[model samples]
Target: MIDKIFEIGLKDIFSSSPAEYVTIKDALDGKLKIRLNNNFYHEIKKDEVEKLSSRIPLYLWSLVKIPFIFIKSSEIGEYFVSGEQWNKKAISILLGREISNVILNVDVEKLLREYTSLIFIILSPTRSYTEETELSEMLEHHHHHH
Candidate 1:
């Protein structure tokens, strides 16, 4: 039925987000992969990781996670990263600016072009309820500061 169909909804079918993410150190060391929400093992390229590693300081290796996940906002030009502070710091360093909120569509592509291997852009043309909650929680913390 209808309920079961909705259970395996569009986001579930499309977004296969990671169940757990690996750290930069783990990624560089050996476990350069993670299990997706759908149980898929996503592999990372060493060369790509190398490029990403060189971008930040050695101390951040464990704080930041591999393959930055960029969420697609409903707005035409807005995309956001709902990750931790270290994640934003890594991205801001790469972007050469402080990205406190959202990164534009243009910036997303530019980074995607150069760091395709280091980034995972979730193209959510349509999203699910859980995802909406996640984004909203991200917003709550976002509004926590000035």
Candidate 2:
């Protein structure tokens, strides 16, 4: 069973105001923390909610070709993925099956690992104080066994 509890703390504090790049930097450095249970799932604390929210800008930078999911007026900069083409592509890559004729049990653990890996790849390196070398080193250390 997957036990993912996502708690975003201080979310209101950061998202309530217009957060510029510098503010985003400070927020990540000061408040963002993620916790995991039994190495199966991870959650962000309510006080460290800003870390989860900080990925918007970096994800925006990666949407150079494919269009990202549309955010409602109230949910700007949030990451979302929808549409059949996107799902088809993702399923193909993840499951190695073009289309399934029978129902298949989704492997939640594998899926979560893949999701976390992709997010780590896309957003973990964009901190303002991190140089390319620092980011690369950090990722190498963090994801080495995975």
Candidate 3:
């Protein structure tokens, strides 16, 4: 049962990559909607998760670690930073401390959305520069020395 949840959540996050695109406002709104509409927030308990993790096969648990590697290895600067930021925040919230390793916690369903957004941003093409002149200048000189 725990493995199923982790598998489902990992599939969703890796396949959808929703967290980078989801705004904080949207996350909060979704939380409220779940709480008011489905009583989901009431159903969440960290102990249940801890128990699942404790019982699950280590190989299954290790699957969640892949996303962190992808995020760290991405070449795009802004997207990498965005993914790092979201990963750090989520992991910290789950552990209630500064987390340095790739341990996933927090609500898996909610994490599916948040992590997807962050991954999507990293995978997307950067569009910060709009003007043709700006683009041309960037093409000529961006990160050439780095």
Candidate 4:
């Protein structure tokens, strides 16, 4: 049950988040649309766009993407704002001081609450891993001496 539940969650996460994002520069100029999974486009609030723009340096206007997508970390209830290095620098402007790519759940709560229009959070199904043998060791280890 738990396994299937998480499977459903992964695809849902992929769909829930906008498949495409508009950059701050484009937004400041005019357009602020986003494309979704095999669906139509939608506009992000211009107010939030400018709000983030004024907070960050003009140096990142073209680089910082809108509607910053945050992925949920399964092990810990924290969130990952995985993105270009620009994302980190932009966040630093708002949160003050540079921080790790990972931020706590409560941290996200306050951030989204403050900038609800500019943020979208979702839980991902697959834990971070690839076709690596290391993971097999850990999973197999889960049931040893059985």
- Tell me the number of clashing residue pairs for each predicted model: 0, 3, 10, 0
Clashing pairs for model 4 are: none
TM-score of 3: 0.24
What do the candidate models score in CA lDDT, each in turn? Answer: 0.73, 0.31, 0.34, 0.70
Ranking 1 against 4 by lDDT, winner: 1
Q: How many residue pairs of model 4 clash at the backbone?
A: 0
User: TM-score of every model?
Assistant: 0.73, 0.22, 0.24, 0.69
lDDT of 2: 0.31
lDDT of each residue in 67-86, candidate 4, tens digit only: 78777776564678855678
lDDT for each residue of candidate 2 in 1-146, tens digit (9 for 90 to 100): 57786556645322322121122233344422322222223222333324223423443222211211121112122222322344334434444645332112233224334343222111212333224644776877752221
**Best prediction by lDDT:** 1
Model 3: residues >4 Å from true position, as ranges? Answer: 1-15, 29-82, 104-146
Which model is ahead, 2 or 4, in terms of TM-score? 4
Off by over 4 Å in 2: 1-82, 100-103, 117-146
For candidate 1, the TM-score is: 0.73
* Better candidate number, 3 or 4, judged by lDDT: 4
Evaluated with TM-score, which candidate comes out highest? 1
Q: Per-residue lDDT for 1-146 in model 3, tens only?
A: 54544345445334533322222333332321112111222222333334433543443332322132223222322212223454455445544545553332222223434443222222322333324534675788842221
